[PDB]
Each structure stands twice: as C-alpha cells, then as structure tokens.
C-alpha cells in the first residue's frame, strides 16, 4: 500500500496472508469468507508469463495477522490448503479478466478477536454501493512505494467512473473490473501496490453496518501514479461462480 496508514488492531480481521513455504516469504493478500474458504486473485496462483503456477502444497494461509514478518504467537493461525479453485475463464493471456480464485482449507479456522469473515455482496448492496465517489478500503502488506511495511497498511479510496478508468489506460477494461483512486486534482493520494495482490477492497454498508468485500486487488500500472488508478476484480459479478464452487465443493 502506498500512502496508506498502519492498521488498527482487529481492523481487518478477514485479512489473510498467502505465505510461500520455501523460501519463506509473502506471496499475496487474500480474505476470509467463512471458517474454511479464502478468496484471492487468480494471478496470485497462476500467471504463466512469469512462470507462476502454485500447487496447494506450495502454500500456507496465515490469518489474524498484523505484523508482516513476525510470527504472532497466540494470535495468528496458520492453515494448510486442501484445494485451489481458479475461475475457468480467468484471462491471464490478455487483461486479467475474472482475476479470482478460491482456496478451501484443510480444517476450519477458529474465529477470534483477530479472525472473522467478511461478507460477500448481494445484488442490492452492490448496486447501492458501487458508485463513483463512494469510498472503499484496501489493506495489505505490499510495497510502500513503486518499501515493505512493518505492519498491515490501510488506505481509503473512492471508486472512479468507468469512462475515467478506461481513459487512463491502453488495457481493455471489462465489466468484471472496477477502478479506484483519487484524481490528480483531488490532491489526496494512495494506491495498492505489488504484494497487495489478492487482498480485499471492502465497503461498510450504511444500511446494516456490515463490511462487504466488493473488490480484489488485481492490477495497476505502477503504483500511486498521477492519472492512473488501481483496478479490482468485481466480486459481485463473479458471485455465481463463487457460489457454485462453494456449493459443489462445500
């Protein structure tokens, strides 16, 4: 996260760290959506241009974290992967369209003050909240600039109108993406960055006061560049796929 702040304790208890076993290092962000399902970006797991193709046994899920590097005794929980599910039409070849994957844990995780699932949007919350100017919140342990933080970073960012998103890049944008970030003339700044990949873009619904994950950190051209915006997978647009997976594989 660039130009964000240290998270408060327990502020994002759905935050998941995807952790590489060997060598031991951050792989990506992710989010807890139930006691055994974790949501992330497909490119965290599969991205052939960079020879990235992780198997279940390559990875661990660390839940409940605050500190980036430290082992947080009596607080974090570390889980093994039972199975990865990547969207069958994830488009790694062109623009990262449908950049979404699910991970099923070997064993259910115990909720705690620091570990708790986020909600996924229904059509009405999505229609009400995904509007240009409405702010969401992005969290992650990724680069501080286009360097690595000691603790979880947080930044709030406004959704940007679709024509502005489109006009800010040569890449082809789809209905399965949205962009967010301040304009140059809005003065404020902030962005996700490398290492934030797979983490959540959340919004707090003013109707029921719950947090919903509207987006997944997916891609951006540089980080916190004037006239550029961060792009997020549109979670509601892919929920049919999410439910199907969760329904067929429980």
């Amino acid at each position: 996260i660039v130009e964000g702040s240290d998270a408060e304790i327990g502020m994002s208890p759905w935050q998941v760290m995807l952790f590489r076993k060997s060598p031991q290092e951050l792989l990506c962000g992710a989010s807890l959506i139930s006691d055994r399902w974790v949501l992330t970006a497909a490119h965290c797991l599969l991205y052939p241009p960079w020879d990235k193709n992780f198997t279940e046994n390559d990875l661990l899920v660390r839940i409940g974290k605050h500190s980036r590097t430290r082992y947080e005794r009596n607080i974090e929980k570390i889980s093994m992967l039972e199975k990865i599910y990547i969207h069958p039409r994830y488009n790694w070849r062109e623009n990262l369209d449908r950049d979404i994957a699910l991970m099923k844990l070997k064993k259910p995780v115990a909720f705690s003050d620091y570990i708790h699932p986020v909600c996924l949007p229904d059509r009405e919350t999505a229609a009400s909240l995904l509007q240009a100017g409405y702010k969401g919140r992005v969290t992650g342990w990724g680069n501080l600039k286009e360097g690595q933080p000691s603790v979880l970073q947080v930044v709030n960012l406004p959704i940007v109108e679709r024509p502005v998103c489109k006009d800010s890049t040569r890449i082809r944008i789809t209905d399965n993406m949205f962009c967010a970030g301040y304009k140059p003339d809005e003065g404020k700044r902030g962005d996700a960055c490398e290492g934030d990949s797979g983490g959540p873009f959340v919004m707090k619904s003013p109707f029921n006061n719950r947090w919903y994950q509207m987006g997944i950190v997916s891609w951006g051209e540089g980080c916190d560049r004037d006239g550029k915006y961060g792009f997020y997978t549109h979670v509601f647009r892919l929920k049919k796929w999410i439910q199907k997976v969760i329904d067929q594989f429980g």
């Binding site: 502020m11 909720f111 699932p117 702010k135 947090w211």
Partner: peptide, 27 residues
C-alpha cells in the same frame, strides 16, 4: 451470518479511526 461485524469494533460498538470517511462518501 455474523459476517462483516468485527469483534473489536462493530461487536463492541466501537468505531475505527477512518470508517467515517467512508460513511461520508455514501452521498
């Protein structure tokens, strides 16, 4: 069922330091 309600914030009726910025943008 309890999703999206944080133990150290919503469950205790405590607000974090910047969630009001989000509320104020929901115009």
């Amino acid at each position: 069922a309890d999703c999206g309600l944080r133990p150290l914030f919503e469950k205790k009726s405590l607000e974090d330091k910047t969630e009001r910025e989000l509320l104020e943008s929901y115009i």
